[PDB]
Design a protein around this ligand. Structure first.
Ligand SMILES: NC(=O)c1ccc[n+]([C@@H]2O[C@H](COP(=O)([O-])OP(=O)(O)OC[C@H]3O[C@@H](n4cnc5c(N)ncnc54)[C@H](O)[C@@H]3O)[C@@H](O)[C@H]2O)c1
Ligand SMILES: NC(=O)c1ccc[n+]([C@@H]2O[C@H](COP(=O)([O-])OP(=O)(O)OC[C@H]3O[C@@H](n4cnc5c(N)ncnc54)[C@H](O)[C@@H]3O)[C@@H](O)[C@H]2O)c1
Ligand SMILES: N[C@@H](Cc1c[nH]c[nH+]1)C(=O)O
Ligand SMILES: CC(C)N(O)C(=O)C(=O)O
Ligand SMILES: CC(C)N(O)C(=O)C(=O)O
Ligand SMILES: [Mg+2]
Ligand SMILES: [Mg+2]
Ligand SMILES: [Mg+2]
Ligand SMILES: [Mg+2]
Ligand SMILES: [Mg+2]
Ligand SMILES: [Mg+2]
Ligand SMILES: [Mg+2]
Ligand SMILES: [Mg+2]
Ligand SMILES: [Mg+2]
Ligand SMILES: [Mg+2]
Lengths: 322, 335
């Protein structure tokens, strides 16, 4: 693992970076980069509501073609499924020999949806964390960790560039791991599906539903299953499972060892393997891309089911009172 | 309603401020109830065994510390914060004789009263202030001007103001800032046991662990499996806690959000769901309680064999190495 002493800030401080997109990653990358003394511009479409926001934040904003053309390093921070079209229409023609094409997820390059020219660097700085937090931890004096990867080293100093960039975005604070595009792609898809988003949300929803279905009030279930999760994860994050388990009661600790493997069971472990299998062999990526080409249809249905769930409406009420 | 969440305007701070509180024990909950109540202007003493090494810790925090018998003797409100399993003995040997007519006996969880392991006398209030969080964070959030939510319960209203006392107690430990719910001792016992089992401790920890292991077992370095499955979890949960799942899902990429919907029902599957209902049955019928008490009477045999194992697991040794390198941990160490 690499830290501040292992990277050279001046490298990215001397390059012009163009952030394409201003969504979850884009704003954090853009703002952290500017705060770090980097010359940044954000490349957006005409009619994008965030144009003014990015501007009020104190950034130069221009269209995508101009940002691409002006930039030494061009970081694609738009949804993975729209990167091939966006690359070809607004990026590709602005790439000069010696330029760096950069990503925060190796998905497109790794599965072959985008094949950059042979005469540019192709790197990734993948923060292991949601963009709002990539930004917040950076402003708090901490930083989200990154994988640094180099798929094509056209200039011979792509490593110094990807590592100075991680420094730019807070990575050296908590740690940078050198990885390949294959490795980031695979571990990232797995984490968000198995544990961080799929596993977690559905675990909380399942326990909330078990209680409400058994006649406990939804308000009670939200405090127990959902609100309190933050506090438990906080202790682990700072001091480990051994500290958290010490904090809780021996009743709760016993209950953990006894109930954990019934809830996260041998089938859930096989599911995790199968999830990774489908990541590895490209069939999940094909499924997602298909759904995207079908107008996010399955994504939108499932979004509406979660958004209208009692855990979400009850939670919205309770939090409005804090 | 069903239910009415209550806040600072529903409670009267002066009530608990007018009573002497004896906190018996100084562990997770102990230190948090004791310090938040002292900060809220309450007359607090900590009750500990003679020669306990936490006595200096409590005294270092500026609290009055004395032996348990004296604490219980002096107190109007006797709050029991030692391990659930030792409560019947600690109570018999050191609390009961000190309870006067019109005293209040208080718990932070309903295990002992609900299941019958402790039968209190009919001349005292029997109440509960159960924070829905860990003791270190009941404390932290309070100092941050927030407060962990509380369940307020009364098994016995001896004096006719037991409710006023339990609600005021909740204010004193920060429950008013986020929400107080009135519940029965039964209700809290059952939901609490269920949360920590299914979701907050068993769920979560096995989930993170199985996540980490899946990756290591497929060949990814344990450092990366830690950043991915463990460290990042605090970030996602913070977004949910602040703003809802809808916002967390907004913050994450369409790639991740599609994967969430696709992978969720797979990892947290129909067997996971059956498991939770059986877990809830064993809680409601008292079997789970009898199993836990049996294990404590039997050398904490299962507890300690699992504790050893997860505490020395690679997720823990690797996480401890990784966290030791954080610039904010080194910054804080310097302090
Ligand atoms: N925090 C996360 O969401 C997260 C974390 C790590 C890596 N990543 C990776 O970062 C990259 C971006 O993810 P995100 O979730 O920050 O994106 P997002 O969904 O937040 O992207 C929104 C931004 O992209 C723009 N955009 C959308 N469609 C467009 C189009 N057709 N043309 C031009 N601009 C368009 C929007 O206007 C907006 O500025 C992805 O490769 C993702 O895998 C995301
Ligand atoms: N976060 C939590 O831990 C939490 C949350 C909600 C409710 N509760 C409830 O609060 C109560 C206490 O839980 P905890 O986890 O804070 O306890 P703990 O396990 O942190 O308690 C340890 C303390 O109890 C004392 N102690 C242990 N055995 C003793 C004995 N035989 N005689 C006298 N003192 C003894 C210790 O010396 C120490 O002060 C329980 O009823 C629990 O269910 C705890
Ligand atoms: N920061 C320590 C004090 C210290 C130890 N070493 C350097 N400073 C406390 O807290
Ligand atoms: C935000 C998080 C789940 N994550 O790490 C991602 O990589 C993502 O959103 O795709
Ligand atoms: C999860 C834990 C802090 N909790 O809320 C408890 O009820 C407990 O420790 O017994
Ligand atoms: Mg990720
Ligand atoms: Mg991702
Ligand atoms: Mg404890
Ligand atoms: Mg414990
Ligand atoms: Mg305690
Ligand atoms: Mg007394
Ligand atoms: Mg609890
Ligand atoms: Mg409990
Ligand atoms: Mg997003
Ligand atoms: Mg999304």
């Amino acid at each position: 693992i690499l830290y501040e002493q292992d990277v050279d800030p001046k490298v990215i401080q001397g390059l012009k970076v163009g952030i394409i997109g201003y969504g979850s990653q884009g704003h954090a990358h853009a703002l952290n980069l500017m705060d770090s003394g980097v010359d940044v511009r954000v490349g957006l479409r005409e009619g994008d509501s965030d144009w003014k926001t990015a501007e009020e934040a104190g950034l130069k904003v221009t269209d995508m073609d101009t940002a691409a053309e002006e930039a030494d390093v061009i970081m694609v921070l738009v949804p993975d499924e729209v990167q091939p079209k966006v690359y070809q229409e607004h990026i590709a023609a602005h790439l000069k020999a010696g330029n760096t094409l950069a990503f925060a997820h190796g998905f497109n390059i790794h599965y072959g949806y985008i094949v950059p020219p042979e005469d540019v660097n192709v790197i990734m700085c993948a923060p292991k964390g949601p963009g709002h937090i990539v930004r917040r931890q950076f402003t708090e004096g901490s930083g989200v960790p990154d994988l640094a990867c180099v798929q094509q080293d056209a200039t011979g100093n792509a490593w110094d560039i990807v590592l100075s960039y991680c420094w730019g975005v807070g990575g050296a604070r908590s740690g940078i791991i050198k990885a390949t595009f294959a490795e980031e792609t695979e571990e990232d898809l797995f984490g968000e599906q198995a544990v961080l988003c799929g596993g977690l949300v559905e675990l909380v929803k399942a326990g909330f539903e078990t209680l409400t279905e058994a006649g406990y009030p939804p308000e009670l279930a939200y405090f127990e299953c959902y609100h309190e999760m933050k506090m438990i994860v906080d202790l682990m994050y700072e001091s480990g499972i051994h500290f958290m388990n010490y904090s809780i009661s021996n009743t709760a600790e016993y209950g953990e060892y006894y109930a954990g493997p019934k809830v996260i069971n041998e089938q859930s472990r096989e599911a995790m393997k199968e999830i990774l299998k489908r990541i590895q062999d490209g069939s999940f990526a094909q499924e997602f891309v298909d759904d995207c080409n079908n107008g996010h249809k399955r994504l939108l249905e499932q979004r509406e089911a979660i958004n209208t769930h009692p855990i979400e409406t009850t939670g919205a009420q309770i939090r409005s009172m804090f």
